[PDB]
Design a protein around this ligand. Structure first.
Ligand SMILES: O=P(O)(O)O[C@H]1[C@H](OP(=O)(O)O)[C@@H](OP(=O)(O)O)[C@H](OP(=O)(O)O)[C@@H](OP(=O)(O)O)[C@H]1OP(=O)(O)O
Ligand SMILES: Nc1ncnc2c1ncn2[C@@H]1O[C@H](COP(=O)(O)OP(=O)(O)O)[C@@H](O)[C@H]1O
Ligand SMILES: [Mg+2]
Length: 327
């Protein structure tokens, strides 16, 4: 009779009870300001979807970030703007300061608050056990908030988490793949970045929810406490599920598929194999043992579960004993 339906265990009907103005991004009217107020300083990054620059707001001599958007569907631009406007001011959510267009190019550009980020490839190696607990709690404040606002980020990964370590400031950025949650909606599974994709996306289970972000957060946590980046290192989307099954095992994978009556794609036939569940303690080594604890492993175990419904919600995660030592 097809795959079994599913819905979020929390904030299930938040968009249903809100007027269409909130979630109907296609009908949202965007007012594009003049980019002449911003002087570009340097390239900060690029991305599948944009060229980002450090800039000065010439009216107040303040550093900002200008994200000049690459040629994609105008529907996607409107979605990112609406979500950023909806979440603006939320805890650890990047602040959209302005929406502008350069007068001659007319290229859509988003203006954000500047975060003096240290690339994760240089920063994660220097973090202490306390710092990992602290920054994970900061991401959880952002996720509990955006999930309460009926929004799934769908691209949680180190490159999308800006950290000003000197000021202990964290911002969740890149809301370009984010979507409104509507119970029963079948979403595109071609979201998130390979290493952080939840098993729901990999087995083409479309009725997913906020819990996808919790799998991605678990992938980040595992890479930080075990110093293994990325933790699940797939070479393609099918191999990504095989990397997961080499850790969580194939028995619990088949239980997940059966609970939701999912049909595994034939491409999995020759590559999945049979794998026993590996204990989390097997990833502890001399280089990472100072970041691992029974609380850390228990918390990781409750995030990295095939069954999206069994995973901790962001609010449940915030109540975990792993966070007792944080503010
Ligand atoms: O640092 P390298 O010698 O280049 O190897 C590493 C790493 O571990 P090793 O250092 O011990 O080889 C990973 O695997 P493990 O050995 O930890 O199992 C490995 O492979 P997987 O992630 O495929 O297991 C990974 O990536 P790959 O060989 O896929 O490129 C590769 O890292 P680099 O790609 O960064 O060199
Ligand atoms: N607010 C910011 N502060 C500092 N750097 C940023 C900021 N926003 C983006 N960047 C840099 O630009 C990159 C791409 O931005 P992002 O919004 O993530 O674009 P894309 O969706 O194209 O990947 C980031 O990974 C980061 O290095
Ligand atoms: Mg990005």
């Amino acid at each position: 009779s097809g795959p079994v339906p599913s819905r979020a265990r929390v904030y299930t009907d938040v968009n249903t009870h809100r007027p269409s103005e909130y979630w109907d991004y296609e009908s949202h009217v965007v007012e594009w300001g003049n980019q002449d107020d911003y002087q570009l300083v340097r390239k900060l990054g690029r991305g599948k979807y944009s060229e980002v620059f450090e800039a000065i707001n010439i009216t107040n001599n303040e550093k900002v970030v200008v994200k000049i958007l690459k040629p994609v569907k105008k529907k996607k631009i409107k979605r990112e703007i609406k979500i950023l406007e909806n979440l603006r001011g939320g805890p650890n959510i990047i602040t959209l300061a302005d929406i502008v267009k350069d007068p001659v190019s007319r290229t859509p550009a988003l203006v954000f608050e500047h975060v003096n980020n240290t690339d994760f490839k240089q920063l994660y190696q220097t973090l202490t056990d306390y710092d990992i607990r602290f920054y994970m709690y900061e991401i959880l404040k952002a996720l509990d908030y955006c999930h309460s606002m009926g929004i799934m980020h769908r691209d949680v990964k180190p490159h999308n988490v800006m950290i000003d370590h000197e000021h202990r400031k964290l911002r969740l950025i890149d809301w370009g793949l984010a979507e409104f949650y509507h119970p029963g909606q079948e979403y595109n599974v071609r979201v998130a970045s390979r290493y952080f994709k939840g098993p729901e996306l990999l087995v083409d289970y479309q009725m997913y929810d906020y819990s996808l972000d919790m799998w991605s957060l678990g992938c980040m946590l595992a890479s930080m406490i075990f110093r293994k980046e990325p933790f699940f290192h797939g070479h393609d989307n099918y191999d990504q599920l095989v990397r997961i099954a080499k850790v969580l095992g194939t028995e619990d994978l088949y239980d997940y598929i059966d609970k939701y009556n999912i049909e595994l794609d034939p491409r999995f036939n020759d590559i999945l194999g049979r794998h026993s569940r590996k204990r989390w303690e097997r990833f502890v080594h001399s280089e990472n043992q100072h970041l691992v604890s029974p609380e850390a492993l228990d918390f990781l175990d409750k995030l990295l579960r095939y069954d999206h419904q069994s995973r901790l919600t962001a609010r449940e995660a915030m109540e975990h004993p792993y966070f007792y030592t944080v503010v």
